[PDB]
From a paper:
Oligopeptidase B (OpB) is a two-domain, trypsin-like serine peptidase belonging to the S9 prolyloligopeptidase (POP) family. Two domains are linked by a hinge region that participates in the transition of the enzyme between two major states—closed and open—in which domains and residues of the catalytic triad are located close to each other and separated, respectively. In this study, we described for the first time the structures of bacterial OpB from S. proteomaculans (PSP) obtained by X-ray for an enzyme with a modified hinge region (PSPmod) and two of its derivatives. The enzymes were crystallized in the presence of spermine and adopted uncommon intermediate states in the crystal lattices.
Despite its small effect on thermal stability, the presence of Sp made it possible to obtain crystals suitable for X-ray analysis for PSPmod and its derivatives, PSPmodE125A and PSPmodS532A. The partial restoration of the catalytic activity of PSPmod was also achieved by the alanine substitution of Glu125 acidic residue from the β-propeller domain: PSPmodE125A possesses hydrolysis efficiency toward the substrates, from 19 to 26%, of PSP, demonstrating increases in hydrolysis efficiency (kcat/Km) over PSPmod by about 6- to 9-fold. According to our previous in silico modelling, Glu125 also participated in the putative interdomain SB network and its alanine substitution increased the activities of PSP toward BAPNA and dibasic substrates by about 8- and about 2-fold, respectively. PSPmod and two its derivatives (PSPmodE125A and PSPmodS532A) were crystallized in intermediate conformations, which are characterized by a disruption of the catalytic triad typical for ligand-free enzymes in open states, while domains’ closeness resembled closed states of ligand-bound POP. As a result, five, three and two bound Sp molecules were found in the structures of PSPmod, PSPmodE125A and PSPmodS532A, respectively. Sp701 is present in all structures, while Sp704—only in the PSPmod structure. The second and third Sp of PSPmodE125A occupy the positions of Sp702 and 705 in PSPmod, respectively. The PDDF profile of PSPmod has an intermediate width and reaches the minimum value for PSPmodE125A and PSP-Sp. This is consistent with the minimum distance between the center of mass of the domains and the maximum value of the buried surface area found in the crystal structure of PSPmodE125A compared to PSPmod. Analogously, if the differences in the SAXS profiles are determined by the ratio of the intermediate and open conformation in the solution, then the intermediate conformation dominates for PSPmodE125A.
Numbering used by the authors: 2 to 677
The structure:
């Protein structure tokens, strides 16, 4: 079977001095119009369809496995907020959810806030970006996208008679906050071209959208604009944030005249985020360390910040929650997430204990501070995702809801925390899981997942889909490679920019170790990763093709240099502090040397499935497309290279959820076939 050969159109870049010829630069089209591009993608999709056609039997098997353990009757965990209990209801034969609420003192009746299906009537796309009731519980602001271009139209509704307002606020990010008069909101506007949150406008609910005065214009290109509100309900915060630096202006939520009040001016490498409660500010700042500390102050002035939790080399401070008698904080240490409660008055401390070798715990939704009930999540590789409600005074823990998993008995699966000494001497943590009865050291197929970017952690949690693999001899693995945030800020900074090469080394080292230690079969080694995890993939294969038999590169970021050079591509402006700006010989040199597209050599590669989305936009469909074209011309091997490009538009990971389960069946079948 001859794979599709793309038309070679030489296009030289030439930056700083050295020239890169890109044969497949023409594959980029920002409108998705070009028939000649469409053809290559259709051709490549058609080839994929043909190669994977005998696996249909398995795909359907896996699809129904993964669907028949998920209740189509899905209610949420109800939360109280402003005296009303709020729940989301999914029911079969209905694509979008129904959001309901009831008086906190009420049981019998439930009121419909917004029905997605009703709003979806007569429209081609629907995605709910935001939904929040005004402080007085009379009005309902909602951020909806009826065109699905990641750009939301805010509308207001009166819950008394379910009547809507005249006006509609357009071109927003969906991020808004009510003022305490319940007739005035601030909202974040994107630019007409760049389409990145940079403007904050004040609207008076029921007035003209033209007469919505601009409040703040964020000039610095690298700074994302956001809107939070404090626990005190006193200040609406304008949270400016780049990847290293941050700034916070305050808006008086009680006065209808309030200009942004400078909290603490932005300083390079000082990331801070605030809250307000008990007539105090509570700040999480990295001014005295990478790992962050919690600080208290009467006013904004940085000098006046008292230290509550000083930064440490060994414990990352991730987040916090305020309550009447207790402070509760999110922390990591030794590759485990953990929680702590600290009494404001007494100073008493209580850790929350857990046996599991590979688990994740986190702070859940706690909107009302005046309670002794903490709400925190938990998940592991053997235990479904679970929400608990702990009484901070009595230590009594009640489980509010589990993840519902049918045809699943937990005792069938073993999990392990394995450390691996990397080439440079650094201990890299690993969270693996396998089926008890299928295991036999050195025979089992091995799937190594990894991300390792932005300081994002691949914390060991539960996966219902993963059971399809485990129940076929597989040992699924999470590699907590540098670039993620599993071992704190240091772990991220040691896996980005000039130390990005550590990410890929860490991945290869973990896989080799696990093979050497007999966790998996050395012939049937497989890997997988998405977006920045697809960058991981594209590099790993270039440098260590021998290791893996098969690969799944999801929506991969493989054309690193060219993409980061070209400003017109969105996301690029914020990612300068991640990979680097190749408008510097320094970063150009380093980035290029791992950049998977620039590093495609004429050698053997593993079996590979590259996936992408055309009309999703923020995937960059061409990066994988070009990458395959080049892999096809250069690779020396007989093994299969397939490119599936999604040609849809609507939905994503919910409502049109089943598309997401089709894609995983496609990929799992692919791997399973190779692993036979």
């Amino acid at each position: 079977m001859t794979p599709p050969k793309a038309e070679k159109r030489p296009y030289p870049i030439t930056t700083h001095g050295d020239t890169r010829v890109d044969d497949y630069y023409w594959l980029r089209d920002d409108e998705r119009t070009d028939p000649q591009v469409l053809d290559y993608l259709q051709a490549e999709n058609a080839f994929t369809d043909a190669a994977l056609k005998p696996q249909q039997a398995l795909r359907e098997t896996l699809y129904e496995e993964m669907v028949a353990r998920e209740n189509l009757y899905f209610q949420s965990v109800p939360y109280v907020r402003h005296g009303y209990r709020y729940q989301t209801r999914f029911e079969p034969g209905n694509e979008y959810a129904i959001y309901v609420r009831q008086p906190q003192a009420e049981s019998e009746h439930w009121d419909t806030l917004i029905d997605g299906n009703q709003r979806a009537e007569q429209r081609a796309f629907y995605t709910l970006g935001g939904l929040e009731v005004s402080p007085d519980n009379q009005k309902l602001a909602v951020a909806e996208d009826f065109l699905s271009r990641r750009q939301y139209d805010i509308r207001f509704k009166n819950l008394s008679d379910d009547s809507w307002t005249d006006e509609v606020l357009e071109n927003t990010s969906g991020s808004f906050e009510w003022a305490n008069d319940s007739a005035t909101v601030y909202y974040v506007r994107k630019h007409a071209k760049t389409l990145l949150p940079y403007q904050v406008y004040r609207h008076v609910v029921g007035t003209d959208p033209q007469l919505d005065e601009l409040i703040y214009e964020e000039q610095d290109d690298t700074f994302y604009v956001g809107l939070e509100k404090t626990t005190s309900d006193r200040f609406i915060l304008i949270h400016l944030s780049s990847t290293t630096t941050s700034e916070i202006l305050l808006l008086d939520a009680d006065r209808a005249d309030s200009t942004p009040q400078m909290f603490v001016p932005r300083r390079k490498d000082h990331e801070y985020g605030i809250d307000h409660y008990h007539q105090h500010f509570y700040i999480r700042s990295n001014k005295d360390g990478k790992n962050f500390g919690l600080y208290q102050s009467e006013q904004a002035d940085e000098a006046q910040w008292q230290t509550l939790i000083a930064p440490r080399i060994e414990v990352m401070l991730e987040g916090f929650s305020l309550f009447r008698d207790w402070l509760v904080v999110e922390e990591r240490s030794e590759g485990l997430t953990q929680l702590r409660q600290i009494h404001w008055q007494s100073g008493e401390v209580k850790r929350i204990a857990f046996d599991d070798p590979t688990y994740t715990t986190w702070l859940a939704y706690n909107p009302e501070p005046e309670t002794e009930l903490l709400r925190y999540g938990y998940s592991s590789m053997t235990t479904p995702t679970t929400l608990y409600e702990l009484n901070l005074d009595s230590d009594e823990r009640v489980m509010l809801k589990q993840q519902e998993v049918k045809n699943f008995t937990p005792e069938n699966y073993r999990s392990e925390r394995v450390w691996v000494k990397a080439r440079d001497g650094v201990e890299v943590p690993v969270s693996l899981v396998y089926r008890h009865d299928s295991f036999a050291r050195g025979t089992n197929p091995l799937m190594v997942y990894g991300y390792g970017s932005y300081g994002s952690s691949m914390d060991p949690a539960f996966s219902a889909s993963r059971l399809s693999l485990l129940d076929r001899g597989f040992v699924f693995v999470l590699a907590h490679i540098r670039g993620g945030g599993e071992l704190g800020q240091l772990w991220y900074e040691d896996g980005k920019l000039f130390k990005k090469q550590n990410t890929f080394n860490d991945f290869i080292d973990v896989t080799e170790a696990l093979i050497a230690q007999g966790y998996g079969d050395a012939k049937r080694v497989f890997a997988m990763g998405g977006s920045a995890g697809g960058l991981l993939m594209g590099a790993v294969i270039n440098q260590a093709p021998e290791l893996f038999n098969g690969i799944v590169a999801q929506v991969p970021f493989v054309d690193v240099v060219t993409t980061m050079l070209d400003e017109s591509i969105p996301l690029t402006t914020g990612e300068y502090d991640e990979w680097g700006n190749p408008n510097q010989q320094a970063y150009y040199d380093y980035i290029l040397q791992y950049s998977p597209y620039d590093q495609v050599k004429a050698q053997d590669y593993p079996h590979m499935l590259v996936t992408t989305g055309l009309h999703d936009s923020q995937v960059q469909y061409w990066e994988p497309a070009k990458w395959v074209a080049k892999l096809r011309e250069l690779k020396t091997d007989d093994r299969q290279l397939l490119l599936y490009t999604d040609m849809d538009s609507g939905h994503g990971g919910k409502s049109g959820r089943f598309k997401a389960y089709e894609d995983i069946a496609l990929e799992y079948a692919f791997i399973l076939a190779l692993a036979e």
